[PDB]
Design a protein around this ligand. Structure first.
Ligand SMILES: CCCCCCC(C)(C)c1cc(OC)c([C@H]2C=C(CO)[C@H]3C[C@@H]2C3(C)C)c(OC)c1
Lengths: 232, 57, 218, 338, 290
C-alpha cells in the first residue's frame, strides 16, 4: 500500500493549485480519504475529508469556501483544488486514508506528502509537554488533555495517537484511546478518562524518537495538538 | 471386501463398549447444578433492566 | 442525531453496501435460473454443448436474456437435503435419453426421477422443460427393437412417431400437479440447434405465467 | 466369516444397550420435578436485519456478541453490527449456494460453504480494506453442511459425504478425517473447551469425535429421522439434537444416553436449528412451522415461542454473553430477540 | 335553482331509491372487504399490482358511498344543497370515479409490462414505483375533479342540464380526459392480447391457451367497463351539444346506476379472479372460525 502525492512548489499568493494523491495497493473506493496539513515548523492541522462515494465532504474553517476536494474512484486519485492561496497555506499536505466501520483503524496510512510554499466551538487539545528528555530503555508518559469530553454515549473514547519520526510521514499508534494499530509493537499503551489521556512507552528504542500527536474524532473540525518531541 | 469394513465396525463398537459410564442421576444432578449456578448470569432466562440491555430501542 | 463522526461514517458505509446489494439483487432478478436435473448422465453433456465439484454453473445469453444453468447431478449425496436450495428456480430442465429403453430399465429410472422431481413439495409451481434427447438413436433402434421391452402395455405400432408420442404421453402423466405446472416436451438430438430457442420460448412462457399469477389476472 | 462379524456386531450393540439400561436408574424428569418452573418468557424482536434478497441459510455470532455473519443464497455474506443494524462487510461469494457460515473466535476470519464442496475462508482484518479469500479448502466430495472454527489455523467441516474433517488452513490440507457416519452429516457443534465435537447425520445418529486422536468416542441414537441441528450444552457434558421427527433430544456424555425428549403433539414440523441459552436452562429450537420455539432443558415444558418469521427458521444462535437470540429465516430477515 | 333539475318522483322514485341504496351498501361492503383483505394479507400488500387493485377497491368504495348518499339526498330526498357542499359533492363523485378509471389503467399498464418485458417485470415495477405512480394518478384525478370547486363556478354561460353548477367547459374537458383514459385501457389491453398471440404463435412453432385465456378475461373486463360507462358518456355528449331540455335527463338519472353496477362488478372481476385473494380469503375465514 502506497499513497504517492504530487503538486506543490512555489505558488504566488492569491494563486490556485491542485494537489493529486495517487492511490495504489488498496481499495481506494471503500476508503474515506483525508488531507492533513503540517506547517513548516508547527504541528498537524486537518484540511478536508471526502467520504466513500463522495457522500459527505467536510472542510476546516480556515479553508472552507476556498478549497474543493474531490476524488476519482476509477482513476484511484484524490484531488484538493484550492484557489486564492494565502501565506498561511504553506505546509506539507498529507494524504491520509481512513475506513470507518466497527473495529476499523482510521488514519492508518499517511502518504509521504507534498511541500507547498506560497511566496510572501472546536475541541482544542493541549499537550503541555512540548519536549521531554528521554534515555533509551526507560519509560515515558505523554499526556494529552481535551477541552470537551471525548467519551461518547456509544462507549468509545475517540482519541488517536500518532508518531512522526524525523523526516517521515506520521504513523498510527493507538486508535480509540486503547487499540494498538496494526504493526505497532506491543510496548505502546494508551489510557484515558474522557478529558485527560496518556500514552506509555515501555522499553523505548531509537525508532520511538519523534513527535507525538493526539487527534480527536468526536466532532468534525478534527483537532490535533502541539506535538511532544521525544529526544535523547 | 466388506469383511474389512465389518471388522472395523466391530472394533469401533468394542472401543465404544468399554467406556466408563456414570449414573444417569449424577449427570442429571450435574446439569441441574450447572443451570442453577449460572442462572444469575443468564439474561435470556431472567430479563435484564432496559439500561443494561445493549439491544434497547 | 446522537451519533459520533465514526458512527455516521459507518452508517454511510452501510448505506453504500445496501445500494450495491440492491444493484446486485436487481441484476440477479433479471437473471433466469434453470436446474439441469437429467437422469443418469445421458442427455446432459449434449445439451450443455448445444447451448453454449458439486455444481457446474453454466451461463449463456439468447435474445438478450441472461440464462444461468446448474448441473447438480454430480453432487452424489442425499437430494432431499439440498433440493430446497433450488426452490424458486424458473424452470427445471430434465433430460431423458430415448435410446436407453433397451439398456431396471434406464427409462424406468428416468421415470422414477421424474416422479421424485415433478411431484416434489419444493417444485409444485416450477415448470419442467423436458428434453427427450437421442432422437436418431431411437429411430435407428426402434426399427429393430420394439417399445415393449420398456413399456409392457403399448398398443401402438413400431413406427417412430407413435412410440415417441407414447413416451411423451407417459412422461406427461407422471405428474399430478396438472394445474400448477406445465411440462414442455421437445424431441431433440445432437444435431439440433433450435434447443436454445426452445428453452427461450419455454422460459418466457413460464415467466409470463408467473407474472400473470402475481398480477392477479389468472 | 462375515456372518460371525455381523453377529459379533449385534451382540456388542446389545451389550452396549444393556449397559445403558443398567446405568439408567432415574429419569431427568424425576430429578427435575421438584425445581421451580421456568416461567412464561416473552421476547420481542429487538432488531431486524434487512438487505438480504434470498433465503438465509446460516449465521454465526462473533465472540464479541455484537458482530454476526449471515449467509444467503443470493451469494452475499453480510457481517452485521447487531447493536446498530449496520452492514460492516458484504463479501461476494463465488458460489451462491451457501449452506454454512462461521465467525472465527478471534474475529479475523469468516468461512462459508455449501454445494460447491468448499467452505472458503475470508480474511476480514486485512490490509487493502477488502475481504479476500484466505484459503479455499477443497477435498470434500459433498456439500459442506457446517464448518466451525477451532483456532485461526484449524477448521472442522461437516459434509454430505458421510465424513467430517479437520483442516489446517495455512497448508490447506485435511489434518485428520473423521469417518463412521453412514449418512450425510448436517450439523456440527464444538465443545466450549474445543477438544471434541459431536456431529449429527441423516443416519439418525450423533457421534462424538476427538479432534486429536481422530477416532469416534461415542455414538448416540434415538432419533427416528435425520438430525439437522446439534448444539453443546454450556457445561460441555451434554448436547442437544433436533431432527425432522419434530423432537429435540438432549444427550449426556458421561452416562452415554438420552436425558429428555422435547416434543409436542401440536408440532409436526422438522427442526432446522438448535441452540442453548447461556446457563443451558433454555433450549431454543428453530422449527419448520416458521416458529422459533423456546423449550426448557430441565423440564420438557415449553417456556415460550418466538413467532416473528414468515418462512422456515434455518439458523439460530445465542450470543456468547447470552444477551440476544438471533434467528434467521428464509424470508430474507435476521431478527434478534431479547 | 335545482327545481328544474327535479325529474325523479313517484313509485319510480321509491324503487330507484331503494335499489340504488342497496347498490351502494353492497358495493361498499365488498370493496371494504377486499381492501381489508389486501391490507391484512401481509404478503399481497407487498406486491406492486395488488396495491393497484386495492386502490381500485378504495376508489370504488368512495364512489359507492358518496354517489349513493348524494343521489339519495338530492333526488329522492329532494334535499336542498348549499353552493360549497354541493360543489364538493360533485368534485368528490368525479374524483372517485376518475380514480377508479385511473386504477383500471394502472392495472392495464401492469398487465402490459407483464408481457412486454417478462423477465424484468418485477424489476421494472417495485412497490415504491407503484406507490409513486398511484400517488401521481390520484393527485391528477383530484386536481381535474376538484377544478369546479375552485376553477369555474358557472360564470354567466350555459351550464349542463345533467350536472347542475358544472359549466359545459368542465364537462367537455372531463369527457376528453376520461375518453383518453378509456382509450389507454382499450389500447393497452389490445397490445396485451396482441403480444400474447405473438408469443403463443412463437411457442407453437417449436411444439392457443394463454392467448385465449387472456382474451376471455380481458374481454370480460373491457366489455363490462364499456357496457357500464359508455351509455352515460353518450348521454353526456348529448347534453354537451343538444338544447339540454328534454326528459332524457330522467334516462341519464336511471342509467348512471350502471356506474355503481360497474363498481360492484369490479372486485369480483378483478380481485376474486386472482387466486391469491381467494387463498387469503380462505385464511381469513379460518382465522374467523376462532
Ligand atoms: C363532470 C364529471 C362527471 C363525472 C361522472 C359523474 C356521473 C357518475 C356521470 C354523475 C351522474 C349523475 O347523475 C346521473 C350525477 C348527479 C348527482 C347530483 C348530485 O350529487 C346532481 C348532478 C347529477 C344530479 C342528480 C343532477 C353526478 O353528480 C356528480 C355524477
Amino acid at each position: 500500500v502506497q499513497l504517492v502525492e504530487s503538486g506543490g512548489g512555489l505558488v504566488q499568493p492569491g494563486g490556485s493549485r491542485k494537489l493529486s494523491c495517487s492511490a495504489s495497493g488498496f481499495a481506494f473506493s471503500s476508503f474515506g480519504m483525508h488531507w492533513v496539513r503540517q506547517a513548516p515548523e508547527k504541528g498537524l492541522e486537518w484540511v478536508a475529508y471526502i467520504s466513500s462515494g463522495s457522500g459527505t465532504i467536510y472542510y476546516a474553517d480556515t479553508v472552507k469556501g476556498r478549497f474543493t476536494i474531490s476524488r476519482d474512484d476509477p482513476k484511484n486519485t484524490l484531488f484538493l483544488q484550492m484557489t486564492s492561496l494565502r501565506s498561511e497555506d504553506t505546509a506539507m499536505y498529507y494524504c491520509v486514508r481512513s475506513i470507518y466501520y466497527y473495529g476499523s483503524s482510521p488514519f492508518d496510512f499517511w502518504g509521504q506528502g507534498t511541500t507547498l510554499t506560497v511566496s510572501s466551538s472546536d475541541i482544542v487539545m493541549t499537550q503541555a509537554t512540548s519536549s521531554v528528555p528521554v534515555t533509551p530503555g526507560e519509560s515515558v508518559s505523554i499526556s494529552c488533555r481535551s477541552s470537551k469530553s471525548l467519551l461518547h454515549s456509544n462507549g468509545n473514547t475517540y482519541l488517536y495517537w500518532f508518531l512522526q519520526r524525523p523526516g517521515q510521514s506520521p504513523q498510527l499508534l493507538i486508535y480509540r484511546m486503547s487499540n494498538l494499530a496494526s504493526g505497532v509493537p506491543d510496548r505502546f499503551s494508551g489510557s484515558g478518562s474522557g478529558t485527560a489521556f496518556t500514552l506509555t512507552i515501555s522499553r523505548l528504542e531509537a525508532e520511538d524518537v519523534g513527535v507525538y500527536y493526539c487527534m480527536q474524532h468526536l466532532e468534525y473540525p478534527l483537532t490535533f495538538g502541539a506535538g511532544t518531541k521525544l529526544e535523547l | 471386501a466388506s469383511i474389512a469394513q465389518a471388522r472395523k465396525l466391530v472394533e469401533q463398537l468394542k472401543m465404544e463398549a468399554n467406556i466408563d459410564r456414570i449414573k444417569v442421576s449424577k449427570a442429571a444432578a450435574d446439569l441441574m447444578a450447572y443451570c442453577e449456578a449460572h442462572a444469575k448470569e443468564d439474561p435470556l432466562l431472567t430479563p435484564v433492566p432496559a439500561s443494561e440491555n445493549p439491544f434497547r430501542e | 442525531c446522537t451519533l459520533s463522526a465514526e458512527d455516521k461514517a459507518a452508517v454511510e458505509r452501510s448505506k453504500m453496501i445496501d445500494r450495491n446489494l440492491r444493484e446486485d439483487g436487481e441484476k440477479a432478478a433479471r437473471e433466469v435460473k434453470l436446474l439441469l436435473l437429467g437422469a443418469g448422465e445421458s442427455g446432459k453433456s449434449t445439451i450443455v454443448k448445444q447451448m453454449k465439484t458439486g455444481i457446474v454453473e453454466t451461463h449463456f445469453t439468447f435474445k438478450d436474456l441472461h440464462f444461468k444453468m446448474f448441473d447438480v447431478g454430480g453432487q452424489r449425496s442425499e437430494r432431499k437435503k439440498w433440493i430446497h436450495c433450488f426452490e424458486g428456480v424458473t424452470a427445471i430442465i430434465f433430460c431423458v435419453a430415448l435410446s436407453d429403453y433397451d439398456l431396471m430399465n434406464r427409462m424406468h429410472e428416468s421415470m422414477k426421477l421424474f416422479d421424485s422431481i415433478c411431484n416434489n413439495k419444493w417444485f409444485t409451481d416450477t415448470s419442467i422443460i423436458l428434453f427427450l434427447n437421442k432422437k436418431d438413436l431411437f429411430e435407428e433402434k426402434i426399427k429393430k427393437s420394439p417399445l415393449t421391452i420398456c413399456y409392457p402395455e403399448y398398443a401402438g405400432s413400431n413406427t417412430y412417431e407413435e412410440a415417441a408420442a407414447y413416451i411423451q404421453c407417459q412422461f406427461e402423466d407422471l405428474n399430478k400437479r396438472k394445474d400448477t405446472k406445465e411440462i414442455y416436451t421437445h424431441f431433440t438430438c445432437a444435431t439440433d440447434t433450435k434447443n436454445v430457442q426452445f428453452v427461450f420460448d419455454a422460459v418466457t412462457d413460464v415467466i409470463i405465467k408467473n407474472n400473470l399469477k402475481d398480477c392477479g389476472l389468472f | 466369516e462375515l456372518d460371525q462379524l455381523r453377529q459379533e456386531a449385534e451382540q456388542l450393540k446389545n451389550q452396549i444397550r444393556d449397559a445403558r439400561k443398567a446405568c439408567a436408574d432415574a429419569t431427568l424428569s424425576q430429578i427435575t420435578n421438584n425445581i421451580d418452573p421456568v416461567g412464561r418468557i416473552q421476547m420481542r424482536t429487538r432488531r431486524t436485519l434487512r438487505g438480504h434478497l434470498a433465503k438465509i441459510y446460516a449465521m454465526h455470532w462473533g465472540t464479541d456478541s455484537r458482530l454476526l455473519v449471515s449467509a444467503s443464497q443470493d451469494g452475499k455474506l453480510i457481517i452485521w453490527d447487531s447493536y446498530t443494524t449496520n452492514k460492516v462487510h458484504a463479501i461476494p461469494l463465488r458460489s451462491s449456494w451457501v449452506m454454512t457460515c462461521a465467525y472465527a473466535p478471534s474475529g479475523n476470519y469468516v468461512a462459508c460453504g455449501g454445494l460447491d464442496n468448499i467452505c472458503s475462508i475470508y480474511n476480514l482484518k486485512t490490509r487493502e480494506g477488502n475481504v479476500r479469500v484466505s484459503r479455499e479448502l477443497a477435498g470434500h466430495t459433498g456439500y459442506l453442511s457446517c464448518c466451525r472454527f477451532l483456532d485461526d489455523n484449524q477448521i472442522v467441516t461437516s459434509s454430505g459425504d458421510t465424513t467430517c474433517a479437520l483442516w489446517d488452513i495455512e497448508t490447506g490440507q485435511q489434518t485428520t478425517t473423521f469417518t463412521g457416519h453412514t449418512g450425510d452429516v448436517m450439523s456440527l457443534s464444538l465443545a466450549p473447551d474445543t477438544r471434541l465435537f459431536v456431529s449429527g447425520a441423516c443416519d439418525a445418529s450423533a457421534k462424538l469425535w476427538d479432534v486429536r486422536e481422530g477416532m469416534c468416542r461415542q455414538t448416540f441414537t434415538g432419533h427416528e429421522s435425520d438430525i439437522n441441528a446439534i448444539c453443546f450444552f454450556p457445561n460441555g457434558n451434554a448436547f442437544a439434537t433436533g431432527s425432522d421427527d419434530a423432537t429435540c433430544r438432549l444427550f449426556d456424555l458421561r452416562a452415554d444416553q438420552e436425558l429428555m425428549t422435547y416434543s409436542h403433539d401440536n408440532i409436526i414440523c422438522g427442526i432446522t436449528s438448535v441452540s442453548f441459552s447461556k446457563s443451558g436452562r433454555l433450549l431454543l429450537a428453530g422449527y419448520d412451522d416458521f416458529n422459533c420455539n423456546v423449550w426448557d432443558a430441565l423440564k420438557a415444558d415449553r417456556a415460550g415461542v418466538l413467532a416473528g418469521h414468515d418462512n422456515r427458521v434455518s439458523c439460530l444462535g445465542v450470543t456468547d454473553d447470552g444477551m440476544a437470540v438471533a434467528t434467521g429465516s428464509w424470508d430474507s430477515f435476521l431478527k434478534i430477540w431479547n | 335553482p335545482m327545481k328544474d333539475y327535479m325529474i325523479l318522483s313517484g313509485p319510480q322514485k321509491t324503487a330507484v331509491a331503494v335499489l340504488c341504496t342497496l347498490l351502494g351498501l353492497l358495493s361498499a361492503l365488498e370493496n371494504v372487504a377486499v381492501l381489508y383483505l389486501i391490507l391484512s394479507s401481509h404478503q399481497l400488500r407487498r406486491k406492486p399490482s395488488y396495491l393497484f387493485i386495492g386502490s381500485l377497491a378504495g376508489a370504488d368504495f368512495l364512489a359507492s358511498v358518496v354517489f349513493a348518499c348524494s343521489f339519495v339526498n338530492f333526488h329522492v330526498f329532494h334535499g336542498v344543497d348549499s353552493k360549497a357542499v354541493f360543489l364538493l359533492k360533485i368534485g368528490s363523485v368525479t374524483m372517485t370515479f376518475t380514480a377508479s378509471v385511473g386504477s383500471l389503467l394502472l392495472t392495464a399498464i401492469d398487465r402490459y409490462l407483464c408481457l412486454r418485458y417478462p423477465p424484468s417485470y418485477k424489476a421494472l415495477l417495485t412497490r415504491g414505483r407503484a406507490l409513486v405512480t398511484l400517488g401521481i394518478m390520484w393527485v391528477l384525478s383530484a386536481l381535474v375533479s376538484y377544478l369546479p370547486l375552485m376553477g369555474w363556478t358557472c360564470c354567466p354561460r350555459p351550464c349542463s342540464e345533467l350536472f347542475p353548477l358544472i359549466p359545459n367547459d368542465y364537462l367537455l374537458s372531463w369527457l376528453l380526459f376520461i375518453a383518453f383514459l378509456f382509450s389507454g385501457i382499450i389500447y393497452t389491453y389490445g397490445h396485451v392480447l396482441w403480444k400474447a398471440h405473438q408469443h403463443v404463435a412463437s411457442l407453437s412453432g417449436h411444439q392457443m391457451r394463454l392467448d385465449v385465456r387472456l382474451a376471455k378475461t380481458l374481454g370480460l373486463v373491457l366489455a363490462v367497463l364499456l357496457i357500464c360507462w359508455f351509455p352515460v358518456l353518450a348521454l353526456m355528449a348529448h347534453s354537451l351539444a343538444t338544447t339540454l331540455s328534454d326528459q332524457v335527463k330522467k334516462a341519464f338519472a336511471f342509467c348512471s346506476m350502471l356506474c355503481l353496477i360497474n363498481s360492484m362488478v369490479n372486485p369480483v372481476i378483478y380481485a376474486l379472479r386472482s387466486g391469491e385473494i381467494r387463498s387469503s380469503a380462505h385464511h381469513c375465514l379460518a382465522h374467523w372460525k376462532k
